[model samples]
Target: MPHAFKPGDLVFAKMKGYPHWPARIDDIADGAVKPPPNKYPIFFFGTHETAFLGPKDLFPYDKSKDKYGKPNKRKGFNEGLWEIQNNPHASYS
Candidate 1:
């Protein structure tokens, strides 16, 4: 499979225990075979969240032409973003 993304590109990434959400590509890793090869770091759109994942778990994301609209609501997607953006003390919980 060929990869079709690069740093700063917008895309949707899926992770365990979380739904696919809009994120921006942060980094692309190479020479990783222990865990899936070609790992990518992506940052969530509405949250200060980021994770490493493989290309298989990523899809192209479009703000104006998204077929599924926005990501489904999640506590971490909303409350977590609020805490990080507004109150810097919320992560103490």
Candidate 2:
């Protein structure tokens, strides 16, 4: 599925080939969703040390928890771990 994002939105993107590695969305494409010549928009994401591409190279934003059983924050990058938006195992009720 295609991921959707807006400016100033707090998001988490899953890294390519490494589902465990995710980052926040710092920016988004300015034009059409998919441009030409292999340039299909862009999502600039990052951590404390590096930045990354988005959409094709990344996954949608999720606000879930992490393996350490804590909220996934910018500091989580230091530990090389990412979390989803919600506790999938938790009951809605």
Candidate 3:
């Protein structure tokens, strides 16, 4: 299914192959480009791009890591690592 995420939305992924690892969703694409057959929309975390999880893994914005490996510590309410609003809350947030 197409990802329900928008630009600047806060999202997370289960860090495939590392379930015990933290969930992360720092960036998203609008599925503008065609993906391989049977693939989902694109998602970006840290510096990695993936096509496994779509809107099903998205959430609303919350504090998270930026593209440069720096913490996106926005000093305000409703500001931080953004994603879809219905996803699970960050464990550390």
- By TM-score, the best candidate is 1
Please write out the lDDT profile of model 3 over residues 2-41, one tens digit for every residue.
4444434444443345321113433323664554544344
Model 2, residue 12: C-alpha shift (Å): 4.6
Report the candidate with higher lDDT, 2 versus 3.
2
Determine which window of 10 residues in candidate 3 has minimal summed lDDT.
74-83
lDDT (0 to 1) per candidate: 0.58, 0.37, 0.36
Stretches of candidate 1 above 4 Å error? 1-3, 27-37, 63-65, 76-93
What tens-digit string does per-residue lDDT give for candidate 2 at 1-93? 633654333334445543334344433336624434433233322233334454555444443333322333544443433222332122212
Best by lDDT: 1
lDDT (C-alpha) at residue 19 in model 3? 22
| Backbone atom clashes (below 3 Å) for every candidate | 0, 4, 15
- lDDT, candidate 1, residue 7? 77
